[PDB]
Each structure stands twice: as structure tokens, then as C-alpha cells.
RNA sequence: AUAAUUUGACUCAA
RNA sequence: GGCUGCCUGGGUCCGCCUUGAGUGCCCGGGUGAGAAGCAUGAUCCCGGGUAAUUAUGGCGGACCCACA
């Protein structure tokens, strides 16, 4: 019923008395409407028709942005949730490309099989699988091993099956659906699909169609009210929830922003479950994303000792004039 | 030779579906119990522990091999 | 009832609107299909717009009502979409239909035009 | 298109009526969109009245 | 520039 | 030694490491119907559209060397 992105960690306290200063830095609430676009991700409801790549370009032109991205490729016929990275927050996609996914799938069957046997086979497709990406793919054609979390059966109408399904990133629905059809005998293809979840992105009120997107944009552009366009885009910290976070002090911010690696004497709070090699998000105390990087220690080693390098800072997003120098 | 298991059914697309426990490779020889040629492996799929195997039949009658035990020639 | 419907349609009047298209088909000329209908509006060619009450999603026809008050054209809603098509003379459904040439339905059309005035303001 | 959704509970189905709560069901697939969006000006005017602008 | 990745791309030429 | 300014390894941000034309598909404009799918666009013509990120080598530039 759940994903590795669902598993909620817990904030651990290495320092309780390290406090935040409200005058430096800008949180998601107190970002100017221009700034929110630079460091913003759109939770988009993608209509079917175009490729995800074409979707990018339209947003690029209509809102007049010079760089944009997406959290994976969804097919023309396919619809649903799509994370949309903007401007500075374009690179945040690297965290959403490997993250867990979930789709709602309809599957036509070419023959007749009594109802109860289907679920028995539908139960059986829970675990690791072997697939080869089809001729129509963006990755190399090699036999990898992808993970399947759960397939809950929605409803059936004889030859058609409605079902909810969540998988690891890169897993092919059409390849699976075809293979389940061969597991029942008569074969199967996919006539329709929609995404429902992608990492920490699901069908909520922050989800938005392209229609409403552009509508709200011109309501601030022509008419000039900020409230509506604000909830259209999300602070880039939304694309971070499913990742281990580290809360750093006011003095540990400015140094890191200048490219510096995070030391242990700079940590105040941290998520539990960290290993060496995992990507960890670096946060201020007001919950603003500073940078991304690989861990040099475990949740124990950062907590116990007072000397050493904890996080290898790799990708900087926060500007330098936000928090002044304190090293 | 090594054993796979019992044959499930013949798909209309051109595949004999067998239920096996081990991981084979691309283009394997398939023979029955008496060392006579049946077909060649084209597609492997399904779960990790017990994967299904689809076979390309290079024989005249793949309709009589329903409810049979197929192997891999070694 | 959906949000693009700005006013209530008495059940007799909707039938009268269907009576228009049905007869219009043979004596005059008509525009069947949302895309066509809209084209018929902006070119000012239209004389009456007939939208269905059961259109999904809302966005496909939404633009019509404000575009009708733009180019002065009176417009009307009808219950079914499946019923709109059959009255327009096709297998499947039509969401919105517009009449160019009233044909014999002249008076029937002109009467609908006056009863939509009061239901507006 | 055939995949529908309830505008009340959040259930996907194939029928016209919600086989669960009993509401009218509508199509899940979002409205088709153009990079030109021809009549966008007019669609905004309808959205103004409903939202109250 | 080379090699990967994201469920969608393949053929060619200076 | 502390500091400025020229100097340069590492880290970090920004640029660049081909562009034409053709297939598939999409979208607009024009047109408006007997497989039945489809008026929420059949057909036919014309126009336009086809993203990103990581790792390493090369190159032009912007900051800084920081256990807080
Ligand atoms: Zn319901």
C-alpha cells in the first residue's frame, strides 16, 4: 500500500539551543512572487496528446522562462501527475528521476478468464521482475532488474481490468501488462494510462491542468493579484520530502553556499536512516533548501563526534546574498 | 539437460508458456523428456523466484504440447 | 447543475430549441460541432447557439456563453448531448450547435430569442 | 476515452453512476490543450464570474 | 566531446 | 605570520563541446462526413512544433578556500 518515499523518518537533535535569525534568508511564505518562480516546481496535471518534452517548451514560452525540466517521461496517450522544475530549481529533477512512482492502469484482455484467477495472478506480480525496454525507449536496450511494490485490484468488467499500481522508477507498464497477459494466456495490451504519484507528488489541490496554469498566470500578469499564481507553483522544498534532510545552523549556511562541504560542527538537526553514499538534502532551520550532496558518515557518526566532514556538498541552489559570511 | 516444469498454454501470438524456477538466457534450445527438438527461447519475464518463459516453436504441431514437461538441452 | 450554465431552462423551451434544429436541418443550414459552432460565432454568421447541459469536461464549450454576449448572439442550453446529435442528424453526440439559416423555423427561432432576453437580466 | 472519476470521493470506475456513493461520474482525462489556446481570453471571463473577480 | 539515465523516439547528410 | 594585489590546484555557479533536411506523432489554420472508431473532428491541403539531468575529458567566464 506504500512506497519507499512514504516511509517517514524522524528528526534527531544533536543541538537544541541553536536558534534561527528571522532577518536573513527567505522562506516559502516570504518569497517575492518573482523569486517563487525561479525556485519553484509546478505540480502539473498533464493532459494526453503531446510528449512530456513538448510540454516543457510550451511552459517555457508562455511564462517566458529560459530553462525548464520534468520528473521523467510520460507518454502521449498517458496522463496525470508531472513535476515541473523551473529556472534555478531545474536540476532538482535528479532526485525525482530515481524516486518511486504510481499509475492507474486500464488493461484490455483478448479472451475470457473467470474472475478469481486474475487476482491470483495479480498477487503473483509483486516483487522483482525482468524486463527489456521496447524499441521505443530513451534508455539503452539491456536486461535490467526493476522493483514492483504493490498491485491492488480496483475493478473488472469481463475483458477489461482497472487497477492501481506503484513501481520503482524506469519500470515499464506496457511491458508488464503484456507479460501479465501472457501469464493468463490470451495476451494483453494497454489501451489507456494515467499517473497518480511520483515521489512526493500526488493528486491534490496543488495539482494543476495547463488551462488553469496559464489562466492564473495572466491573472497576475494582466490583472495583478498574487494569491492564485502562488499556489500554482510550489516551493522546490516539496521535491525533497522523500529525501533525508539535514537542518543546519545560520553560520553553516553562507560557508556551504560558497561551495564548501558541510562539517559535523555545523549540524543542528538531521533525519534518521542515513548511510554513506546516499543523497541528503541540506536545509536551513526555516525549511529552505540550500544544497544537495552525498553523505560521508552515518546517522550515528554525525551525531556522536565533533570533528570531521559529514556531507560532500555537490549541487548548490541557494543564492549567496541570502545569509552573510560566518565561517 | 535441465528441467523447467509443466507447460501452461500456447498463446495465439506464437508462444508456448512454461512455468520455471531458474533464470535462462537468450536463444536457448528446448527439448522434451526424450531429447527431441521443440523450439527456441525468445522472451523471459515475470517474478524473480518463479519466472514465466515464452517459447518460439520450430515444430509443426505446438498444439499437442499442452500439459507437458519441457527442458533445456545441455 | 454545472457552472457554465448561467440560467435555468424551463423544460418546454428546451424542447422548442430542439424543434428548431430538427426543422432547421431540412429547410435552412446549421453548424454541428463545438469547433464549427465557435467558428460560426466569431465570424458573426450564427443566429442562435444551442449548447448541451451535460458537457464533460466543462472547458470544451465554456468559452461560448461569454463569446455570445460579445457578438450579441442569443444562446440556449438543452438537456442531453446524445439527444442534441440525433436532432442535428448524426449517429453520435454534439455538445454545441449553431443555426445560420432559420429556414421555415424563422418564427420559432425569433420567439426563443425573446424569451432568452428576460431569463438573462 | 473511458477512464472516469468521482468528483466527490475519489474513486475510478467505468460506469456513469458512482457504483459506491451514488454521484454522477465524469471523465478523468484533463481538457486537451493548445500552445496557442485560441479563445483563452473568453475562458478567463467565465472563470472570473465563478471565482468572483 | 564520450558513456549512462527518465516508461517515446527512429532514418540520413556535410 | 596578519593583510592587499598579480599567481595558481580543489570546490562551487553560469556558458560551450554541430546544424541542416527527412519518417513517425502532435498541434493550429482551412475544410465538415456512412467500417463507426469518431462533430469532444472522418477525409484532403498548408503552415508550425519534438526536454532534461548525472559522471568523466576539453574550453571561455564568475565567486571563494570556509571543521561554522
Ligand atoms: Zn463517489
Q: Could you characterize the architecture of this molecule?
A:
The complex is a heterotetramer of chains A (about 325), B (about 70), C (about 120) and D (about 55). With about 325 residues, chain A is α+β, with helices and mostly antiparallel strands. Chain A contains eight helices and 17 strands. In chain A, strands 2, 3, 4, 5, 6, 7, 8, 9, 10 and 11 form a ten-stranded mixed beta sheet that branches. In chain A, helix 5 packs antiparallel against helix 6 (about 225-230). Chain C is α+β, with helices and mostly antiparallel strands and about 120 residues long. Chain C has helices at about 10-25, 35-40, 65-70, 80-90, 105-120; strands at about 30, 50, 75-80, 95-100. In chain C, strands 1-4-2-3 form a four-stranded mixed beta sheet, with helices on both faces. In chain C, about 35% of the residues are buried. The interface of A and D includes residues 48, 154, 209 and 219 of A. The complex binds zinc ion (ZN). Zinc ion (ZN) binds near residues 8, 9 and 21 of chain D. Chain A binds a RNA duplex (14 and 68 nucleotides) through helix 2, strand 3, helix 4, helix 7 and strand 13. It is classed as isomerase/biosynthetic protein/rna. Keywords: rRNA processing, Ribosomal protein, isomerase-biosynthetic protein-RNA complex.
Discrete helix count of chain A: 8
- CA gyration radius of chain A, whole angstroms: 22 Å
Q: What form of chain A results from the Cα inertia axes?
A: globular
Largest sheet descriptor of chain C: 4 strands, mixed
So, CATH architecture of chain C?
2-Layer Sandwich
Biggest interface reads: A-D, 27 and 21 residues
Total domains of chain C, how many?
Answer: 1
- End-to-end distance of chain C: 20 Å
CATH architecture of the largest domain in chain A: 2-Layer Sandwich
Portion in strands of chain C? 15-25%
Question: What is the class of chain C in the CATH system?
Answer: Alpha Beta
PDB class: isomerase/biosynthetic protein/rna
Keywords: H/ACA, guide RNA, RNA-protein complex, pseudouridine synthase, Isomerase, tRNA processing, Ribonucleoprotein, Ribosome biogenesis, rRNA processing, Ribosomal protein, RNA-binding, isomerase-biosynthetic protein-RNA complex
Assembly: hexameric
Entry title: Crystal structure of a substrate-bound full H/ACA RNP from Pyrococcus furiosus
Structure, briefly:
Chain A: Residues 243-318 form the PUA domain. Chain A: It comes from Pyrococcus furiosus (strain ATCC 43587 / DSM 3638 / JCM 8422 / Vc1). With 327 residues, chain A is of the alpha+beta class.
Amino acid at each position: 500500500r506504500i512506497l519507499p518515499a512514504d516511509i517517514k523518518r524522524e528528526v534527531l537533535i544533536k543541538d537544541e539551543n541553536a536558534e534561527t535569525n528571522p532577518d536573513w534568508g527567505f522562506p516559502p511564505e516570504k518569497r517575492p512572487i518573482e523569486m517563487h518562480i525561479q525556485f519553484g516546481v509546478i505540480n502539473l496535471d498533464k493532459p494526453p496528446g503531446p510528449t512530456s518534452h513538448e510540454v516543457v517548451a510550451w511552459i517555457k514560452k508562455i511564462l517566458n522562462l529560459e530553462k525548464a525540466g520534468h520528473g521523467g517521461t510520460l507518454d502521449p496517450k498517458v496522463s496525470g501527475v508531472l513535476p515541473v522544475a523551473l529556472e534555478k530549481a531545474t536540476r532538482v529533477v535528479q532526485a525525482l528521476l530515481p524516486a518511486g512512482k504510481e499509475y492507474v492502469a486500464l488493461m484490455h484482455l483478448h479472451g475470457d478468464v473467470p474472475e478469481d484467477k486474475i487476482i491470483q495472478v495479480m498477487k503473483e506480480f509483486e516483487g522483482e521482475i525482468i524486463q527489456r525496454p521496447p524499441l521505443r525507449s530513451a534508455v539503452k536496450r539491456r536486461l535490467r532488474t526493476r522493483k514492483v511494490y504493490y498491485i491492488e485490484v480496483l475493478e473488472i468488467e469481463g475483458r477489461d481490468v482497472l487497477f492501481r499500481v506503484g513501481v520503482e522508477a524506469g519500470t515499464y507498464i506496457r511491458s508488464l501488462i503484456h507479460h501479465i497477459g501472457l501469464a493468463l494466456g490470451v495476451g494483453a495490451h494497454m489501451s489507456e494510462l494515467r499517473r497518480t504519484r511520483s515521489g512526493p507528488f500526488k493528486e491534490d489541490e496543488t495539482l494543476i491542468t495547463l488551462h488553469d496554469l496559464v489562466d492564473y498566470y495572466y491573472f497576475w500578469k494582466e490583472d495583478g493579484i498574487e494569491e492564485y499564481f502562488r499556489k500554482a507553483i510550489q516551493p522546490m522544498e516539496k521535491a525533497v520530502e522523500h529525501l533525508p534532510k539535514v537542518w543546519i545552523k545560520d553560520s553553516a549556511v553562507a560557508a556551504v553556499t560558497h561551495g564548501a562541504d558541510l562539517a559535523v560542527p555545523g549540524i543542528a538537526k538531521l533525519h534518521a536512516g542515513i548511510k554513506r553514499g546516499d543523497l541528503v538534502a541540506i536545509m536551513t532551520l526555516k525549511d529552505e533548501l540550500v544544497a544537495l550532496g552525498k553523505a560521508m558518515m552515518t546517522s550515528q557518526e554525525m551525531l556522536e563526534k565533533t570533528k570531521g566532514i559529514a556531507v560532500d556538498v555537490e549541487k548548490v541552489f541557494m543564492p549567496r546574498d541570502w545569509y552573510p559570511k560566518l565561517w | 539437460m535441465k528441467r523447467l516444469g509443466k507447460v501452461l498454454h500456447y498463446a495465439k501470438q506464437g508462444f508456448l508458456i512454461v512455468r520455471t524456477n531458474w533464470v535462462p538466457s537468450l536463444n536457448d534450445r528446448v527439448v522434451d523428456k526424450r531429447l527431441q527438438f521443440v523450439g527456441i527461447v525468445k522472451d523471459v519475464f515475470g517474478p524473480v523466484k518463479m519466472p514465466y518463459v515464452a517459447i518460439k516453436p520450430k515444430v509443426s504441431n505446438p498444439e499437442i504440447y499442452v500439459g507437458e514437461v519441457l527442458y533445456v538441452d545441455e | 447543475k454545472p457552472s457554465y450554465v448561467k440560467f435555468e431552462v424551463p423544460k418546454e423551451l428546451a424542447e422548442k430549441a430542439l424543434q428548431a434544429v430538427e426543422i432547421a436541418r431540412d429547410t435552412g443550414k446549421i453548424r454541428k460541432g463545438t469547433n464549427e459552432t465557435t467558428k460560426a460565432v466569431e465570424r458573426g454568421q450564427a443566429k442562435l447557439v444551442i449548447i448541451a447541459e451535460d458537457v464533460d469536461p466543462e472547458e470544451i464549450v465554456a468559452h461560448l456563453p461569454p463569446l455570445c454576449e460579445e457578438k450579441e448572439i442569443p444562446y440556449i442550453y438543452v438537456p442531453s448531448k446524445k439527444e442534441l446529435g440525433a436532432a442535428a442528424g448524426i449517429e453520435v453526440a454534439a455538445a454545441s450547435v449553431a443555426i445560420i439559416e432559420p429556414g421555415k423555423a424563422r418564427d420559432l427561432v425569433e420567439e426563443i430569442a425573446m424569451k432568452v432576453k428576460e431569463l438573462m437580466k | 476515452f473511458r477512464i472516469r472519476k468521482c468528483p466527490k470521493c475519489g474513486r475510478y470506475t467505468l460506469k456513469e453512476v458512482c457504483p459506491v456513493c451514488g454521484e454522477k461520474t465524469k471523465v478523468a482525462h484533463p481538457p486537451r490543450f493548445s500552445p496557442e489556446d485560441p479563445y483563452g481570453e473568453y475562458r478567463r471571463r467565465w472563470k472570473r464570474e465563478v471565482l468572483g473577480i
